[PDB]
Structure formats: structure tokens, C-alpha cells
Design a protein around this ligand. Structure first.
Ligand SMILES: C/C=C(/C)CC/C=C(\C)CCCC(C)C
Ligand SMILES: C/C=C(/C)CC/C=C(\C)CCCC(C)C
Ligand SMILES: [Mg+2]
Ligand SMILES: [Mg+2]
Ligand SMILES: [Mg+2]
Ligand SMILES: [Mg+2]
Ligand SMILES: [Mg+2]
Ligand SMILES: [Mg+2]
Lengths: 308, 303
């Protein structure tokens, strides 16, 4: 049971609003037309709101609902990228991303824009009511880098080229949109970090470690379904190619890198400099937020139908 | 004492063969926009050292941008506006509008017209992705300048940790590093541009450039009653002598140089093309480290 080796020296939590928020995410998906014909009875068991509830457990219900709807949006987009033809067609992906990028700049969707474009416009509108311009620009750029990473994946599929470990790990930090999900922690915890603390090297390194942990945990849990689709965006498959080793050996190596990255995150937590009382209180809420996300990803993924 | 002679690097810089005509054109450009002994400024000779392999057109943009930053900085650091947050906010709102692409008007100051000209010229050489990254680094520079202003108004000195974290933005070095891509005509993919070791190399280079400046600029900053200087922040935190504070600053500078050259040897192998472009970028960071020191040691600005 290699899944038992996905362990952390810290624990998570879930919002008491979990089920209400999950029901509302399904209703939101239906409203914006994101539910496919093949998802009729499967829709019930997606449980995207139960991931959001674990990721942002202290959030007010309104803010948690934006986070839940955003997480649903990312799953709907991701299954298009990873399980349909658009993920093998760079020109179709560029055309769609041009529409998403226009909407992120504040453009209103046109009559013939697709469901995902309208849904993204709804999330931007709702975040604009809750967040200042500074935040919206930072979130938008993390989302742009996620689209860039999806186009990078598409070229890999079109070329039949598995990236090396160094390239994969560097790109994977963007292909999961985890940095955009970290941006929501500020809104959930209602914290305003000053520029010098937000961008501090140790904070960047804690964010990088948490992102790696989440993505490599996902890779160990999602390699079966990704292999079923002939995909190559997975630390297990990337390690297997680089080392020319067995699948068990690649899984063992991936779980070693995951365990090492957890110890790096725990180590670097004690390396946050003292700025002042107020900044360090806010900063500790943000880093606690990263820990809730690490736990949310594993806790939800171990029980989710998505990886069954 | 010869403490300036301890600012050494285990590498050398270079200067563009176009240095003087660019310097003369920068001085002319500054006069044309009314931002302006003038011949002693030599802002073009900093740009020529920072971007030594740049085509003349691109070097001229970089030179006019460096001149702009110096003109802005002397308003912030030697003028009343740098002690007035409401007046700073008002001016920044006009800059942030021009950066988003808004046309200047009759009410806007010389710096606003000059910034609009630079954004126009950069928009002809760089894609939207670049303009956004550059604009955000400039935005963070303005934010750092307002942080400086509140420090002056409240007469507060930040601790070493706070000063060093903020100083990475108060110098606009990251905005200057963005111009390396255009100077070298390289396109780094997202995963390499934002890689942790690249970020750590940029941070080390920025710290080196800023702390070198601090050691050379503490006298003129003391004369203006300013406290945005590693030497002065160390003096306040450790309650030590000025010589001890300078020695402490130079030890941190030397350590950061050792960190930069060590982290160069930790750049991963992505692929042949990406690593070719990356070495041009990182070499660019080294040209900037040498440019800052080489120019500053002979500049009348720090005489
Ligand atoms: C982001 C992807 C991983 C694996 C980490 C957390 C999952 C999230 C935030 C929702 C899924 C968004 C898609 C990219 C699948
Ligand atoms: C940036 C500051 C240092 C000390 C190195 C490079 C100098 C430059 C790029 C212009 C000087 C004006 C700025 C302080 C606004
Ligand atoms: Mg994916
Ligand atoms: Mg997927
Ligand atoms: Mg996966
Ligand atoms: Mg100054
Ligand atoms: Mg200054
Ligand atoms: Mg100075």
C-alpha cells in the first residue's frame, strides 16, 4: 500500500459548510453549462466542494463558494486538456486561451464564447467584489502561467516527447494552477501582507515546497488514469523515462522526493525572519494556509472517485 | 580608509562600444522632456556597462530608463515629496495609469510624459507578457518608495530583515533585470524564467547591487537625514560604530557574492536551447553587478 507513505507531521481541517458548498458548486456547474452528457449520475460524486472545504477550512461561506466554484472550473478545464482532443491541438488551445486572457483583462464574453469562458468571467466578477486590483493582477498572472503550462503539455503530446525530471518539475509548479489557489488563502484568511513579506525568498521557497508536495502527491495518485489516456505529465512516468527503471522503482523514487520535500517545508517554516508582530501574525496564517492545502489535496484525493 | 576596495567580484564586466553616443543622446532626451555639470551625470555610461551586447536602439531605451529612475529617485530622496505620502500616492496613480497605456494630459508632470515615451518605445520591442512583468516590477518600486516615505514621516528605522526584504524593490533592479531579455534577444520559457535557482540568482544579484550602492551612498544619504541604507540600519539594530556597521555591510556583500557564484553551479539542465538562453540571462546579471560597482566608483553622484 504505497498510498500509506503519503504522510505529513501535521493535520488538516474541513469547513462546517462543506456539503452546502458542494451542492452549490454542482448547481453553479449546471447554471454555466459545464456538466457533460456522460456525467449525468457521475456529477453527484465529483465532490469538488469537499476539496475546497478542506483547502480553506476557516473561510466565510461566500468566499469558500468562490474557491469551490474556481476548483470545479480547474477540474472541468483539466479534463478537456487531459482527456479530449483539444489537449493534442495547440492552435485550438491558443484560440480558447485568447478568449480566457481577454476575460482576465475584464472583457465581457461574446454571444459565441464557450461555457468555460462565461464561467471564468463569473469568477473574475465575484473575486473583483472581494479583492483589490493588486491581488486580481497577481491571481490573473498565476492563471496565465497555468494556460502557458497547458500549451506546454499540448506540444509535448503533439511531439510525443516526455520531459526530463528538471523540466517536468519546473513546469508542474504551473500546470496544476496551485499558485492561483494559494492566492485565495489571503482572501479566505482576510490577510494583507506587505510587498516585502509577500515576495520574501523564504515565503517563495515555502510556496514552492507546498506546490511540489501537492503535485507529486497527485502524480502518485493519478498515474493509473494518466497512463490509461497515454499521457506523460506525471513524476512517476518522467522518473521511469529518465532512469529507465520499473514502475514500482519509479513510484518508490517519487515517494522519496515527496517525503524529502515535506522535510524541506517543515525545515524552512522555522527560517521565516521576524519583520514585526503584525506582519509575522499574518505570515503565520498564510503558511498555516499552505499546510491546510497540503493536507486537503491528500485527504480528498485518497477517497475521491477521480483517482479510484 | 580603503573600504571601497573590498567591493570585489570573481568576474569582470564589459561596456557597449556605443557608450558615448548613447550617453550624449540620454542627456539630450532628458533635456527634451525637462527632467534636467549635466555632462558629469553619465547615466548612459551605466546603461552601456549593464547591457554591453545590446543593439544601440535597445541600449538607448535602457539608458533613458536608468536616467528616468535617477531623476525620480532624487525627487524621492532629496525633495519634500519623499516626506509626503498623499503627494506620492497622487503622482504614482498617474504613473500606474501611463503604465496601463493611458495618454498623458496638460496637468501631468515631466516624469509622467517621459515614462509614457519609454512605455511606447518598449511596446515596439517587447510582447504583452513582458510589459506586464516589467510594469509589476515598476509598480512594486513605487510601493517600496511609499514604504520609504512612511518611514521618513513616522521617523522609524526598519530592522535588517525588513530593510533587506524591501530594498529588493526600492532600487527597481528587478525592472532593470527584465531589460536583459530584450538586450540579449532571448525568450526563456515560463518554467525556466520562474525556476527557484533563477529567482535565487536574481535575489543575490539584486542584494549585491543594492548593498554595494549602500556602502558607496551612505554619506550623501546621511547628509539628507535618510535611513534607507544597510550601513545605517545595521548601526541602529546592533548599536555599533559607523566603521563596524560598514565592515558588517561588506561581510554581507562578500557572502552574497559567494552565494551568487555557488548558485550559478546549481542551474539544472533543461535542454540545449533553454540552457543557452539561461546562461545569456545569468551572464547579464553578472554584467549588472559589475556595471553598478564600476560606474559608481567613478560617478560624481557618490563623490
Ligand atoms: C491543480 C491540480 C493539482 C493536481 C493540485 C490541486 C488541484 C486543484 C487546485 C484543482 C484541479 C485543477 C486541475 C489542474 C486538475
Ligand atoms: C536602482 C538602484 C541601485 C542602487 C542600482 C541600480 C541603479 C538604477 C537602476 C537607477 C538608480 C535610481 C533608482 C534607485 C530608482
Ligand atoms: Mg492536468
Ligand atoms: Mg489531469
Ligand atoms: Mg495528475
Ligand atoms: Mg537615492
Ligand atoms: Mg532611493
Ligand atoms: Mg543609495
Amino acid at each position: 500500500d504505497y498510498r500509506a507513505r503519503l504522510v505529513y507531521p501535521f493535520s488538516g481541517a474541513i469547513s462546517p459548510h462543506a456539503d452546502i458548498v458542494d451542492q452549490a458548486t454542482l448547481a453553479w456547474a449546471a447554471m454555466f453549462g459545464l456538466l457533460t452528457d456522460s456525467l449525468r449520475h457521475k456529477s453527484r460524486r465529483l465532490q469538488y466542494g469537499l476539496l475546497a472545504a478542506r483547502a480553506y477550512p476557516r473561510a466565510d461561506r461566500e468566499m469558500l463558494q468562490i474557491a469551490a466554484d474556481w476548483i470545479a472550473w480547474l477540474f472541468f478545464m483539466d479534463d478537456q486538456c487531459d482527456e479530449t482532443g483539444i489537449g493534442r491541438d495547440l492552435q485550438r488551445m491558443i484560440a480558447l486561451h485568447e478568449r480566457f486572457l481577454a476575460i482576465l483583462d475584464g472583457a465581457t464574453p461574446e454571444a459565441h464564447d464557450c461555457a468555460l469562458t462565461y464561467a471564468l468571467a463569473d469568477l473574475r466578477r465575484r473575486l473583483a467584489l472581494r479583492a483589490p486590483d493588486n491581488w486580481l493582477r497577481r491571481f490573473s498572472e498565476h492563471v496565465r502561467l497555468y494556460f502557458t503550462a497547458n500549451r506546454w503539455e499540448t506540444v509535448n503530446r503533439q511531439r510525443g516527447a516526455t520531459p526530463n525530471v528538471a523540466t517536468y518539475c519546473a513546469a508542474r509548479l504551473f500546470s496544476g494552477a496551485v499558485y492561483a489557489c494559494f492566492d485565495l488563502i489571503e482572501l479566505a484568511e482576510q490577510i494583507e501582507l506587505p510587498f516585502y513579506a509577500r515576495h520574501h525568498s523564504i515565503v517563495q521557497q515555502l510556496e514552492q515546497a507546498a506546490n511540489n508536495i501537492i503535485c507529486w502527491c497527485n502524480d502518485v495518485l493519478s498515474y493509473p488514469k494518466e497512463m490509461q489516456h497515454g499521457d506523460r505529465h506525471n513524476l512517476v512516468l518522467v522518473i521511469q523515462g529518465e532512469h529507465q527503471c520499473s514502475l514500482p522503482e519509479a513510484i518508490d523514487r517519487a515517494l522519496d522526493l515527496h517525503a524529502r520535500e515535506v522535510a524541506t517545508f517543515v525545515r524552512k517554516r522555522t527560517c521565516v525572519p521576524y519583520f514585526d508582530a503584525a506582519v509575522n501574525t499574518a505570515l503565520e496564517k498564510y503558511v498555516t494556509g499552505l499546510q491546510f492545502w497540503i493536507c486537503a489535496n491528500r485527504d480528498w484525493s485518497l477517497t475521491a472517485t477521480r483517482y479510484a
